[PDB]
From a paper:
Vibrio dual lipases/transferases (VDLTs, e.g., VPA0226 of Vibrio parahaemolyticus, lec/VC_A0218 of Vibrio cholera, and VvPlpA of Vibrio vulnificus) are a class of virulence factors secreted by Vibrio pathogens to disrupt host membrane structures. VDLTs contain an N-terminal domain (NTD) of unknown function and a C-terminal catalytic domain belonging to the SGNH/GDSL hydrolase family, which is named after the four characteristic catalytic residues (Ser, Gly, Asn, and His). Therefore, VDLTs are enzymes with unusual dual substrate and catalytic promiscuity, which could benefit pathogens in handling diverse host lipid molecules in a proper manner. Crystal structures of the VDLT from [name] (ValDLT) and its fatty acid complexes were solved, revealing prominent structural flexibility.
The apo ValDLT was crystallized in the P21 space group with two protein monomers in one asymmetric unit. However, unlike the occluded active site in VvPlpA, the active site in ValDLT is readily accessible from the solvent region. A polyethylene glycol (PEG) molecule derived from the crystallization buffer could be modeled in the substrate-binding pocket of each monomer. Nevertheless, the superposition also identified conformational heterogeneity in both terminal regions and some additional regions, such as loopβ3−β4 (81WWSSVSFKNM90) and loopβ8−α5 (202VGGAAGENQYIALT215), indicating flexibility in these structural segments. Notably, loopβ8−α5 is located at the opening of the substrate-binding pocket. It exhibits a defined conformation in monomer B; however, in monomer A, most of it (residues 204 to 214) is completely disordered, lacking defined electron density to trace. In comparison, ValDLT contains a canonical Ser−His−Asp catalytic triad composed of residues S153, H393 and D390, with the oxyanion hole contributed by the main-chain NH groups of S153 and G204 and the side-chain amide group of N248. In monomer A, the oxyanion hole is ambiguously defined, as G204 is located at the disordered region of loopβ8−α5. In monomer B, the same region is in an ordered conformation that brings G204 into a proper oxyanion-hole forming position, due to a Mg2+ cation that bridges E208 and D263. Furthermore, another oxyanion hole residue, N248 in monomer B, differs in the side-chain conformation from that of monomer A. Unlike those in VvPlpA and monomer A, the oxyanion hole in monomer B appears to be well-formed, with a water molecule occupying the putative oxyanion hole position, stabilized by the hydrogen bonds from all three oxyanion hole residues, S153, G204 and N248.
Residue numbers in the entry: 30 to 203, 215 to 418
């Protein structure tokens, strides 16, 4: 995008409204959500000033001078739910028909030298709503998956961002990581006072490539190395990396052959050694890298769930008893064991994805790692 098209979009100042989403139930066993327009204390509609921009139709981001904390506070005050599990999220919307557009809060010209946002790249372990908006709010079904998250609540990146009180800008899609990098590079050219050294990047991918597309280990390794080359060349300094959990331990592989399981598992182990090597490579160059061994953690969770506060690591919480992508389009009841224990005691929500309690557990172990993240300046 041209420097003239950047200033041209920035000068096209308007306003929009804020859609405040929330979990309707007080229990995380129920994924259903609803929304209200953010209001001011006087009862008038809350608006934010700024400019829109999109590289392609309906894929709009709204850029505002208003901070994420001010917007979050307006939603909290408007909703007044007395719901400890409200799990509020918010977006820019002109009216009830708008998609859920991400609000980018522009940084100040005089930012201190400290991490001030999280930018996530990856797949369904990280997506907070991209494929959901792209599918017109149909995939995954919003009665059985929490508002576009492939789980019953927040994913690990949201828990990390929450713990550090940082805004989270998500590029993960439940379109490839190379395209997500290109998209991140394009949208941030429209951001004001953007310094990539103040961004904490999260990156996880490879499971979809091995599980769904049967991609070779070298091509996935090459794409991963490419994503880090492109981000570091564009000024990225801070990363949270993770090894891949062995997805063959998820319930969906009850329905796969042993030969398929062994193939995928072998690819995962090879990729994980490469991820560890990549983390070392960037650490050696002076980058701030936090590597967490999610693979080792999932081996423990799936072999001894009781040692980690879980009762079941073998079945989905949802009553899904097959592996079919069609199931993401429909509403499902919880299976009896999960309705009895609560979803906070199951490792898996559906046949593939962790519950939000597992996502929180992973986030907390990641936050602990590298001496409470001693190389990052928050
Ligand atoms: Mg490649």
């Amino acid at each position: 995008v041209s420097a003239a098209e950047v200033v041209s979009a920035q000068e096209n100042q308007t306003y929009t409204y804020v859609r405040c989403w929330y979990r309707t139930s007080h229990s995380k066993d129920d994924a259903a959500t609803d929304w209200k327009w953010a209001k001011n204390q006087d009862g008038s509609d809350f608006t934010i000033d700024g400019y829109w921009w999109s590289s392609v139709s309906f894929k709009n981001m709204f850029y505002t001078n208003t901070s994420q904390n001010v917007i979050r506070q307006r939603c909290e005050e408007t909703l007044d739910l007395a719901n400890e599990n409200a799990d509020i999220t918010f977006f820019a919307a002109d009216n009830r028909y708008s998609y859920n557009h991400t609000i980018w809060s522009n940084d100040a010209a005089m930012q201190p030298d400290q991490i001030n946002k999280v930018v996530a790249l990856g797949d369904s372990l990280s997506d907070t709503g991209n494929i959901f908006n792209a599918s017109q709010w149909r995939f995954p079904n919003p009665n059985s998956w929490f508002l576009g998250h492939f789980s019953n609540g927040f994913v690990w990146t949201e828990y990390v961002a929450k713990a550090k009180n940082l805004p989270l800008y998500n590029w993960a899609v439940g379109t490839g990581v190379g395209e997500q990098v290109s998209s991140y590079l394009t949208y941030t050219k429209l951001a004001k006072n953007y310094n990539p050294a103040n961004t904490l990047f999260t990156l996880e991918f490879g499971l979809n490539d091995f599980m769904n597309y049967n991609r070779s280990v070298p091509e996935v390794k090459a794409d991963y190395a490419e994503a880090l080359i492109r981000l570091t060349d564009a000024g990225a300094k801070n990363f949270m990396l993770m090894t891949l959990p062995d997805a063959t331990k998820a319930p969906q592989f009850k329905y796969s052959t042993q030969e398929e399981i062994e193939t995928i598992r072998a690819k995962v182990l090879k990729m994980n050694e490469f991820i560890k090597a990549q983390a070392m490579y960037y650490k050696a160059q002076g980058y701030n890298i936090a590597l967490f061994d999610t693979h080792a953690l999932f081996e423990k969770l799936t072999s001894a769930p009781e040692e980690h506060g879980f009762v079941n690591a073998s079945d989905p919480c949802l009553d899904i008893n097959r592996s079919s992508s069609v199931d993401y389009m429909y509403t499902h009841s919880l299976r009896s064991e999960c309705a009895a224990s609560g979803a906070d005691k199951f490792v898996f929500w559906d046949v593939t994805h962790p519950t939000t309690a597992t996502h929180r557990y992973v986030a907390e172990k990641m936050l602990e790692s590298s001496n409470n993240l001693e190389e990052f300046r928050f």
